[model samples]
Target: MKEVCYEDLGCFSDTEPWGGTAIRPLKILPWSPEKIGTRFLLYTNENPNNFQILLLSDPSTIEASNFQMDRKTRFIIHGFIDKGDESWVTDMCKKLFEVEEVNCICVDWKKGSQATYTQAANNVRVVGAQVAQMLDILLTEYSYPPSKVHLIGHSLGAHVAGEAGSKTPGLSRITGLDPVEASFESTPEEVRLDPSDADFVDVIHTDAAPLIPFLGFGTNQQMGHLDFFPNGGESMPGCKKNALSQIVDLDGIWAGTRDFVACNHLRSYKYYLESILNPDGFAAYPCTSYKSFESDKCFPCPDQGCPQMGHYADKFAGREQQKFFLNTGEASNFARWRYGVSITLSGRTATGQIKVALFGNKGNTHQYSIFRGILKPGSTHSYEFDAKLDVGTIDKVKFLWNNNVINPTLPKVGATKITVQKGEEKTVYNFCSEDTVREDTLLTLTPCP
Candidate 1:
């Protein structure tokens, strides 16, 4: 058989395309469609668990199956070394059925997903082309509006979705679940996933640290119109388990090992699944940087309103790319409420630590440190923090202060006003305290008259 050169895979060479000698290089040609064997599994309310196959060659199969044209379609794609039938993919489809009656298709390219990461990365282009071809068929034959389609892709699959979006015209949305950082980081927009791929692109970054040393697989660059950085996107809250232990706990050594290494990477899809059921669960605020978010400058959302990180992110759409930050719990039901506290000192400057315990209808929160450095008189210090408890309608607050150890006598620090702002509710409460707070004591504040 005669050999021909391909544009995406690079020029053909001896036997196979010449892959440069490196740990991971993007040089290999993608496998043919027949060999890669990409499958589109359709799931609906009728067959929520058992998925029906949708084929481009056999358009009759789509019509014969429970596929509905009027309903919205969501295409889910998995990342490197992952399969479409994985529990995460199926679970997301099931959850989507529970939330809305939409056509959920799991794009399975497991045949091409394995092997070297570079080969898999190159293979995604073919998978994306396949997906786009299918969408084009739908648009032409069924006259389906492209605006009704939503592509949800995780890790490398995110880029695959982007590739498909780039090919498909007027794609409504593309939800990137931590697009891989290895080969795609800072790459040209034409090569990797970018905001131009779809009308409204939303991204969830769970493991966006440097690839080397940090072992982070997700990209740090903002690829979507609304990019969410959960817990600063460097490391997840509960992925600290050692590989061997994780292997033993997960029952299967290989799969367990995979989970241990990709725990933060896996969180992207997990959070997206939760967001499907609970639309208002993950509330993220637009901030220039994560440090600014930590300081509570992005609190109370904004007049334009904060964007929900996952499924409902389209609520706040704009041309400019926005990066949002929020904290999550260690496990399931990971949503947390954000609160901003500002305190204005009235008395002399004192070096000590200040902590606050907030009380509300639900319960009191843990003593959270609001100010630790020297509190200057007439100067106001503001802090932002996340709480697991809802603390609905906060009515009381307790302040604790610890004086400097070297001082013989306890120095008193007085605060003239204490203001608390709730992020989601956009409500502000003011408190006044007449007495000065002494070291190693708790001072309570009541609402202003």
Candidate 2:
């Protein structure tokens, strides 16, 4: 083991106690000089004291690189240690440091040697904060600000990366690869894992089962442009077989972990990586074989399985409807209105007219006008035009307002437009007989295939 110094942080190759040292929780694992080329790389291996997880100190940098070959680019290996034993931490660190291909920085948090959960949690926070600060310093030294940083974290390390990226200014990208389950619970919405927080946030759930309680929700952000839900959204095999299940069994950790894993969070990452790396021809990654059980609480109707299941079923039913219409040549069933709008005018208006232009698929436009008379102001009117289906389909109808102001901006009122199938009957109701005149007009048309 060799030692390398970077600013205030001290890096040691030899394994030692996890306390009092300036570099208390960080173990420096430098790449061989022979392998260090023109490309500058930073790798944050997994924390042995925590679960064996990976947290790429900065992943955005890698993403922005112009390397044509995905695999040829530098990488940061992030892993975690479920047990916070010194031996385990040391062993994990040694194995990670052995990779001489890229510059590596192993985060050795105090939690690795902590004896209790409370102690570990506290240490995790402290160490996480410290690592964040250290990363900031490294950014300055490397002449790369947060905007140039690329972060990647696996499981619990993902939480750590999120914390670090949040604290750091201008982080360009953060990839949460199966972020840890429970660590993100109380995190602020701004700091949660999502594309909005950074320039680009790409989450890969290999085994997305939450590690802690209340940690999964809101972690995914709406800013995520490309969210890949793989294996029909379920748990990954690696997480199912690991000690992660123990975390899942914990009362505080159960719900989120179960749902995340059941959704197969991590497999998305594997599939994405495989697809990008082997674009021409690729083999499918090993997916979880474990079938997910529908929970009674989350899934109210067992027969329906889940909300998503019901939605897919509905989609399938819609396909069946399409097939039926297609096979039976039942065009009437698919009929719809060409134009519909409600109107209300003020004052004592007797006559009005509305004109609209219709465009055809052949790039030609046609004008159609409707004339209305014997209509009083302060009264409402409903109208429907039986537009001929030209160009084999009606794309849209543009409304042209004419005559007295209908539905004044200040005190708005409205008239209705209704559409009925080809064979349906419509009943017209008298307007003045009642205080209000409601027109129940229906326009029937042929079904769309």
Candidate 3:
């Protein structure tokens, strides 16, 4: 096959054959160069083969409509290409400028093209690393850093996005629309999923496989939020119904197919986009439509579905729950007894040392530790520590911030403190220690097992 750039394919010229709809150059420009506070939407296209089909064979009208609607958000779509296509990257960049009028860049490298399961797994890692680097540069350049950036991906793109978000520093939110199942087959536990990787990560599983199988199967990374079993979990509205048998159709054969399903993923993304744009109108879907093979005794049950599951739950349930676990430390017996506390800071940098002391009855100190760190402005800082405790035991933890009060950069906003006991209730306290007014507040990590 001859190598072709997006422009070479006639995707970027002001005028093109096919009614100028099929191929448009990427638009690349810095988003709101004059404004420091800017939001970016980074979109990763699905499989390369499918991307070509959509770009080359489809009616340019569909692609044009996408570009037009996407421009409203001023999103910069960054296409990822493996070794074969360098022009796709170039074309994506050119189109980013041509369509969205924003600075767009592609993470050009070969991260498998989803021809096989093994290759897809390998590519997830490579693509993930590339995305992590892109995020680092983008965040630093925008002055918001990783914590302020949001990530979204569709199908296999979601898989790569999840991996990248996990490794990126201080990533606040990630949205995954129907993450691909093929890559999950061989994905490492650590690399595949985790909510701790980002502040708020949500997954909207449109046509993906069973979440329970993937959950705690490969990686125990806590997913913060999840919305699965939509239109029957693994099955969606447009998927072909299995004619062989109910079991084979719903779970066996349908689940085995590897063909790209853009419409399925797009439906999930549409709901997600709506939520992001208008949170007040965010309607939680039903979470009880899908059944777990194990939980349902291997017989698919209608009641086993989780229709209320939203993008947030689908993607970040494990991670967000993990955050909750760290803060609350309430898990069933037999699991290790653990507890944690975190502090969040915003605005001016604050320098101070925090002391955590565990106290028991009669003023007896059980355990104590100190954390020293500097809180940077427009950043969320956290301190975490874990300790084993007896089941059903309650302990009081106190935090003391030691610093010179004079000439404090900002009034010491009080600290937010939380304590979790294994299988017991958790406590939270927010204290403003700053002498001056502050714009942001600290978040206490919740315990999630």
Candidate 4:
């Protein structure tokens, strides 16, 4: 028996009998669009908050709608169990309208996306084909070029955009927001989202933790030409709050549950939204590993300048698969400046917590814990942390030591010198204190050279 293929759309087959797909062993064909109920909602400056459905079956809908052929087109796709009307989707469209008068289309397949994970994954093929068919119509009828089209998808939707991009000849860009990892992690490029999916693909990985024990929903694999890892790409900050309390405080139970289970996963779009307004807020440094980024090895942005993580990522060209790292705050106003601090201890061994505060032209920073244990004599302690304050330039540094044991005869911890490197500025400041720093006392030091 031959599987039924839809000819109206971009030749969508029912099964994965083509090649390279092994995950769907038993049955992996996609449901028909009629059954899946996929809808493309278009929104422009004319209807910023409202949306007009763009149906492939009826060309009149597009002809009558506010569809402009001259403007750029952006298609937003949501992930598993998410609908097109999700506040984040409209919110993204609204923010985009503020920046440019482009056509925004939210692809909705909630009916197809709400099924079992495997089934939902399979249904993306049909949705992708439908979107490709729409693109074909726009190109053939209105003379709109694929080079002016950008596809933005989150999680499974990222793979959806990939499928559509593979079918279309030349898609300008695809911004993958934390593409899912489960079945797509080891899949081939044809099966998952890859850099080849578009002319320039950029990805923001907010929840790339291990899938087994950590149960991270997103993939840590580099799926785009430029991949960004925020806060080491593991568990995101500010997600430690109680889910039940969040449920009580938030608007709805589902929103609370989503924030609890996939707060990091959902941050992909939140950060993207913020990037539209604050273009330089999320500048990321290119580094092989997050550890090297923390040690200040990847700072000072290269000759090409660091790439902004979200909206303006396409401004710079990433010739190859490049991984970038940056830090963020726990909650809203998530952008943070990274600083590397190094302290060399020369005095007697002391078991206590060593904290430092930085002051500059902008303002003073909160006390950051550099070391919280025993500091052996002649040991150099170096670490990096993100601060809300930019600090501007290095003026002075304050060091405080709290001893674990209260003893009058104990020797104070002395620092030979200290060094501070601002990640963004790529400037190094060296400071030295003359006296041995006593417990519970603040030691202020200025630039030595």
Candidate 5:
């Protein structure tokens, strides 16, 4: 694969097929479905396992599938190299059923989807338009308003949902699960998922890393009204390994890379599954960036309120894009407790010297440091970290302040104030005199707030 970048997209000639790399350039050919097959894999209360297929050609199949126009209907789509028959689709459909009994249909464009990544991506537009046509059939046959429909899709499928939503009239909502980064990252609005696709667009981005000589499958761009990044939208915590390690694990190097990438790439749907089935504990704080999110600056979830993580997410009223972030576990039941701590130094000082290490539920000790400089009285800076270990409540922290070796006991400080933020409630710990001096360890460091 030739090296790629954002600048490359603009540099390409319009007439050339720029998408030669696995990370192809954006080009939407004419919408033609003779080569692509769009099947509505419908599952309802009566027929759960056995799905009734509705083809675009049949007008009466919408009625035959028993798709009610009154009740809310859902259109779910899968990305590259996938079909509706996959287990995750059934899992999501089953969970949606558990939440509310509605028409849940999966868009299976299996033949077009089975092609190369670039080809499959190119083929999604046709599938998307075909979907709108099916919805048109329903609209014409039963007077169904397009606004009642909700579409959910993963990877390239997410863009497919957006395309259909944009073409169809007044689609109520669309949920993009880690929409594919390659070939569509900065493409024109018509080629990718955009805020205009539906009345409401909520996205969950689990793998927002880049794709070049090839790795990431999702984009970091804000593609929705309320963009939610469960874990910084980059490399997920547990999925550090790429596609190259499986065959080489514990024995030797498998000399592979792409296959294992699938594991990290598919987490968007996995997180969506967890959020949908068990809709508790996935509240994401609205923060400017992940840095502020880590600093525990975004607070007051109860007072200011935060957006719901999954299917129940509310629609946005304002135009400015809002980003929400939260921490999650590696597997199912993906909620993690967020802990924020800020330390403030007080007293007269010649030089700044500080070393802080936080010991918590996680087996390892998390430590950070402040740079050396001339200090003013009452200077303070805060730090944020999350506690994901299963030991439950973390009330105690090991605190330490290192002494300045160069200027020993020159300028004396009085006390240090520590603040721990945990939604609505905060714990303050004060260390005075002796503890603030040279090297003192506060083993029984418990907040008195």
Candidate 6:
């Protein structure tokens, strides 16, 4: 077996470990179709339905299962060491069943997926082609239109979806949940999940870190028609920073080992799982980049309107590939509204910064900042932010204008225009409930009377 080595990360071929000298996990390269096991669990509101269907096997199994024709079908694929029975897959299937009546066929490549990163990646290629063979049967034998199919995969399973859709290029849609990075990041576009893999590919990248210090589980490239980089694609909220804690987190790992190091990487689909039910919940704003998404430019939304970040993203078709960014709650209710702040005054503004706190539902206080801006007597400057605390409703806000002592000139505050959002719901606070806006001490605020 030829060794496959990456830059700085050392070499891992079927012949060696991760690093040349350091002891690491051994690897394998299975390029044949038989290396991976593919299962089609035709979940149709039925029982004892773990039906096994093979690409080259008899068509009786496909006919025997509750698999319906001309109906919406979903191919849910898993990444790394995951097989069909993983909690995310089963739970996703259950939730999807509640959302819609459709066929859910989960691909289980555990034997092939259990090898080293590089090996399992190649194995995914075989798995991808094998899945295409199943689709081929539907397309050729059963006359299933690719328009009725949707491919959803997380991490490596994302690429597996890419490979499968590459075969049946007319696929209705493909949702990539943080597609993997290693062995395929710089590889040919054909080797990875590119935008051409499906008719419409919507990606959610939760982990875009490199391989060395952090787990390089998913690629950061813009591979889908719409790519969502929630929380800048790394160090996702709710994930503990302690490396060991990330490794041994009770809820994430040991349903499998690959997840032991990629709890945040796994959040790609975790967020998607929520997006299925709350399609409009995880609203994302299209930005020039994540850099500007955090800047004052981040407010309102695009003129054409912001697209849904996950499952129900079918509304956007024939649109150009675009990258969007949004922040999510650490908990189950993962959507937060964007809010903007602008100030008008007659004094030095570029001297220091202003502090603010957004108080929301149930004792939630989220800290925010306003960059110093020189606002002339009748001029205005604006800055935008989101509530850090995931509390659903925002009721109160506190602001503190900490002016600098250099050449004392008290900047008289006129008003602060608070623009919440647009193209969905509108909330703008143009008047302050208080009669005077002061500096130094905190200015406690609420809705105007």
Ten-residue region with minimum lDDT total, candidate 6: 16-25
Q: Estimate the overall C-alpha local distance difference test score of candidate 2.
A: 0.34
Candidate 6 vs. true structure, TM-score: 0.75
Task: Provide the lDDT at 109 for model 3.
Answer: 27
Full-model lDDT, candidate 4: 0.81
- Residue 382 CA displacement from its true place in model 5, Å: 6.0
lDDT (C-alpha, whole model) for all candidates: 0.79, 0.34, 0.37, 0.81, 0.66, 0.67
**Model 5 C-alpha lDDT per residue in residues 327-375, reported as the tens digit of each score:** 7787665765554555666556646555454444544335445434655
Superposing all C-alpha atoms, what RMSD in Å does each candidate have to the true structure? 5.3, 20.1, 22.3, 5.1, 8.8, 7.7
Mark the regions of model 5 whose C-alpha exceeds 4 Å error after superposition.
1-34, 81-85, 243-260, 300-303, 315-319, 341-421, 424-449
Query: How do the residues 340-390 of candidate 4 rate in per-residue lDDT, one tens digit apiece?
Result: 888887568878888888899989899898988888767888877778867
The worst-scoring run of ten residues by lDDT in candidate 3 lies at 322-331
Q: Cα lDDT for residue 205, model 4? A: 95
Best model per TM-score: 4
Question: Model 4, residue 315: what's the lDDT?
Answer: 90
Per-candidate TM equals: 0.83, 0.35, 0.37, 0.84, 0.71, 0.75
TM-score for model 5?
A: 0.71
Better of 3 and 4 by TM-score: 4
Task: List residue ranges in candidate 4 displaced over 4 A.
Answer: 14-21, 68-70, 82-85, 209-214, 240-260, 291-303, 344-351, 373-380, 409-417, 432-437
Please provide, for model 6 over 220-305, each residue's C-alpha lDDT reduced to its tens digit, 9 standing for 90 to 100: 88888899999898768887542432332222332353344556777888888888887667778888878898875655765566
Judged by lDDT, which candidate is best? 4
Q: Write down the lDDT that model 6 would get.
A: 0.67
Between candidates 3 and 5, the lDDT winner: 5
